[PDB]
Amino acid sequence: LYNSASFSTFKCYGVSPTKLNDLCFTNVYADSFVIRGDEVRQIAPGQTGKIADYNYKLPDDFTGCVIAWNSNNLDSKVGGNYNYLYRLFRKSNLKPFERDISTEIYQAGSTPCNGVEGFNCYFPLQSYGFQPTNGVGYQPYRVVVLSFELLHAPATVCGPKKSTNLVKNKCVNFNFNGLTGTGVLTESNKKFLPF
Amino acid sequence: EVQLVQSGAEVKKPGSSVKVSCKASGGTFSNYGISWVRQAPGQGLEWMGRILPTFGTANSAQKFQGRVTITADESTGTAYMELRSLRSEDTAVYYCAKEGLAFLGYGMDVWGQGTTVTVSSASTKGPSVFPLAPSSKSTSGGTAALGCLVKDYFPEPVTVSWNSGALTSGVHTFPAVLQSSGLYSLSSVVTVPSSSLGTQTYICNVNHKPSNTKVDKKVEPKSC
Amino acid sequence: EIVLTQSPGTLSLSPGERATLSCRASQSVSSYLAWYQQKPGQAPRLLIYDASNRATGIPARFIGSGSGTDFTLTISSLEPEDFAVYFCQQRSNWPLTFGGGTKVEIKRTVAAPSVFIFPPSDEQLKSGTASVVCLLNNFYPREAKVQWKVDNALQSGNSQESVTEQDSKDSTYSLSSTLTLSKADYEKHKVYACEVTHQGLSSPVTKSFNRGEC
Numbered sequence: 001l002y003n004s005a006s007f008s009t010f011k012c013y014g015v016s017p018t019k020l021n022d023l024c025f026t027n028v029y030a031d032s033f034v035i036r037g038d039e040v041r042q043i044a045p046g047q048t049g050k051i052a053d054y055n056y057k058l059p060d061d062f063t064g065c066v067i068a069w070n071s072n073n074l075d076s077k078v079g080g081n082y083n084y085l086y087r088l089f090r091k092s093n094l095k096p097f098e099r100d101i102s103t104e105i106y107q108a109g110s111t112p113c114n115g116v117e118g119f120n121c122y123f124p125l126q127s128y129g130f131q132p133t134n135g136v137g138y139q140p141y142r143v144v145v146l147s148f149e150l151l152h153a154p155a156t157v158c159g160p161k162k163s164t165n166l167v168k169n170k171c172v173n174f175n176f177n178g179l180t181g182t183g184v185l186t187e188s189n190k191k192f193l194p195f
Numbered sequence: 196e197v198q199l200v201q202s203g204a205e206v207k208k209p210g211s212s213v214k215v216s217c218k219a220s221g222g223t224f225s226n227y228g229i230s231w232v233r234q235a236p237g238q239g240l241e242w243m244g245r246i247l248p249t250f251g252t253a254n255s256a257q258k259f260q261g262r263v264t265i266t267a268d269e270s271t272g273t274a275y276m277e278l279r280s281l282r283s284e285d286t287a288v289y290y291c292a293k294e295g296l297a298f299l300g301y302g303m304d305v306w307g308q309g310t311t312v313t314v315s316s317a318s319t320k321g322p323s324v325f326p327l328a329p330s331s332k333s334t335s336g337g338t339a340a341l342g343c344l345v346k347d348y349f350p351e352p353v354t355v356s357w358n359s360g361a362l363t364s365g366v367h368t369f370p371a372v373l374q375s376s377g378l379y380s381l382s383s384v385v386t387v388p389s390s391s392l393g394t395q396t397y398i399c400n401v402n403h404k405p406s407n408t409k410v411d412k413k414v415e416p417k418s419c
Numbered sequence: 420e421i422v423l424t425q426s427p428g429t430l431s432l433s434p435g436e437r438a439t440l441s442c443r444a445s446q447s448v449s450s451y452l453a454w455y456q457q458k459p460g461q462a463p464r465l466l467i468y469d470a471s472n473r474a475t476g477i478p479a480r481f482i483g484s485g486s487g488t489d490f491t492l493t494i495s496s497l498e499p500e501d502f503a504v505y506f507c508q509q510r511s512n513w514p515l516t517f518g519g520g521t522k523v524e525i526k527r528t529v530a531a532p533s534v535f536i537f538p539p540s541d542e543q544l545k546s547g548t549a550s551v552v553c554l555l556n557n558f559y560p561r562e563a564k565v566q567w568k569v570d571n572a573l574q575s576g577n578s579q580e581s582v583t584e585q586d587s588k589d590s591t592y593s594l595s596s597t598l599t600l601s602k603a604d605y606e607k608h609k610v611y612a613c614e615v616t617h618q619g620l621s622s623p624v625t626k627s628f629n630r631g632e633c
C-alpha cells in the first residue's frame with residue numbers, strides 16, 4: 001500500500017507508516033466512500049464542515065489512517081453521475097464513527113412539515129454533479145479510512161515476518177518464531193511429532 | 196447527455212383535466228429530482244412543483260395546492276403532472292427539467308421541449324382567408340406592400356407561404372392574436388416593387404393542419 | 420416568498436459591447452442564484468449557477484458575481500447568439516421563484532416607419548364583420564403608437580396590435596393593427612385614418628382613405 005505511487009493522500013496519524021509491519025493489531029476496520037476533491041482535507045481529526053460534521057466524524061484520538069486517490073475515470077460520466085449523494089442537513093452533529101441513513105425531511109423552522117418539502121423544510125440529501133470536464137478539487141476522490149484497534153482479545157492480524165536463508169555448520173545467531181540464541185546449526189537424526 | 200422527451204400539444208376545454216408526461220430518454224430514473232415550469236404566452240416563467248422520483252416525494256407551489264398532482268413511474272421512467280379544474284388562463288407552454296436531488300443549489304440543467312396546452316371553448320374551425328389588395332398605388336413610386344389576412348381559425352398553427360414558397364424576400368408573418376370571440380387571427384404581407392404590379396401574380400396558401408385545409412387566394416388590385 | 424426584480428427592462432445594446440444585468444432580491448440569499456437564457460421559441464438553458472459557477476459548455480465570456488441581495492451577470496464580448504431574454508431564479512427556499520426578464524436587443528441607426536392602409540375587401544364584406552388594417556413596416560426602435568380616427572373621431576377599445584420579432588438582416592421591427600367592427604358600423608361612417616407617432620418621425624404621418632370609391 002505504501003509504495004504504490006498511485007495514491008494522493010496516505011497520511012497516518014496514530015502510528016508510523018513504516019512501523020505498520022511491526023506492530024500487531026487485534027481487529028482492522030476499513031471504511032470506504034467517494035467525496036469531492038476539496039473535501040478530502042476534512043477527513044481528519046478536529047475538522048469541521050458539511051461532510052465531516054454530520055457525514056463522517058473521525059475521533060480526536062484516532063489511530064488508523066486515511067487513504068485517498070483521485071479517480072476521474074470510473075465514477076464520472078458525461079451528463080453527471082447522480083448515484084453519489086451526501087447529507088448536508090441534520091438536527092445535530094455526529095459523534096465519531098456513526099452512521100445515519102434516515103431520510104426524514106429536515107425542518108429548519110418551527111413549522112410542522114408533514115413529510116413534504118415546503119417553506120423552511122429542506123430535503124436532507126444532495127447529489128454530486130460528477131462531470132468529466134471539471135477542474136481538480138471538484139473531481140471524485142475515492143477514500144479508504146483504515147482504523148486499527150487494541151482489544152483485550154489476543155492480536156490476530158498483523159504483518160508478515162521477513163525470513164532469511166538458513167546456514168549450517170557455522171556459528172550464527174538463530175531465531176525461529178521467538179526462540180533466540182547462538183550456536184551451530186546441523187541436521188539431526190531425530191523424530192518429532194506433527195505438533 | 197440525459198434527454199427528457201415530452202408529450203404533444205393537447206387542446207382541452209375549461210373545467211376538464213390534463214396529464215402531461217415527461218419521459219426520461221435513456222431508460223429508467225435515478226436521483227434526478229424533476230420540477231415543472233410553465234410559461235404564459237409572451238410572459239416570464241413560473242415554477243409550479245417538483246418531484247423526487249426514486250425517493251417518492253412531491254408537492255406543488257402554495258398557489259397550486261389542491262389542483263396539481265405530480266406522480267412518477269420508476270418502472271418506465273416517466274413523470275406525470277395531472278392538472279385538474281383547468282381554467283381559461285391556465286393555457287401556456289409546460290416544461291419539465293431535472294434539477295439535482297436537492298432543494299437548493301445547482302439548478303435546471305436539462306430541459307424538455309414544451310407541451311403547448313390550449314384551454315378554450317371552441318371546436319376546430321377552418322380559416323377564412325381574405326386578400327388585402329395593393330390599395331393606393333401612390334406611396335413612393337417603386338414600393339408596394341400587399342398581403343392576405345387569415346381570420347377566425349382555431350387552433351394554432353397555420354403556415355402562410357407565398358407563391359408556393361418561391362418568394363421569401365420582404366415577407367412578414369405577424370403572430371396570431373386571440374380575439375374576444377375565442378378564435379385566432381394573423382396577417383401576412385409582402386413588400387413588392389411597383390414595377391412588378393400588374394404583371395406578376397401572387398397567391399398565398401394557408402395550411403391549417405387540424406382541419407387539413409388548403410386555400411389559394413389570388414391577390415388582385417383594386418378592381419380597376 | 421422572495422420576490423426578485425431585474426433591471427432594466429430592455430437594455431438595448433450593440434454587438435461587441437458589454438452587458439450588465441441586475442437581479443436585486445427582496446431578502447437575503449447567500450450565494451444561490453441561477454441565470455437562464457431563453458432564445459425565442461425554445462427552452463431556457465442554464466448559464467450561471469451558485470452565482471459564480473459557469474455551467475458546462477458555456478463560453479467563457481459569461482461571468483457572474485454579487486452575493487447577498489444584489490447580483491450581477493456581465494457579458495464581455497456580445498455576439499449575435501447572445502441576444503435573448505435572461506432570467507434569474509433564487510434557489511434558496513420554497514418556492515423557487517423566477518424573475519421578470521431582460522430582452523437584450525440590438526441597436527442601429529433610427530429608421531422611418533413605412534405606413535400603409537388596406538380597406539376591407541368586398542369578399543370580407545359578405546358577412547357582417549369588416550376589419551381595417553394599418554401597417555407599419557421596417558422601423559426602429561420598438562416604441563411606436565397607432566391611433567385610429569374614424570370620421571376624425573378618436574377610436575379606442577376595438578384595436579389589436581401585433582409586433583414581429585427583430586429581423587436578422589436589418590434589425591428592424593414591423594407592426595400591424597386591425598380595426599375590427601361590424602358591417603353596420605362600417606356602413607355608418609365615411610372616412611377612416613390611422614395615425615403613427617415615432618421617435619424617428621419629425622411629424623405624425625397620417626394615412627387615410629374614403630369609403631367605397633377607390
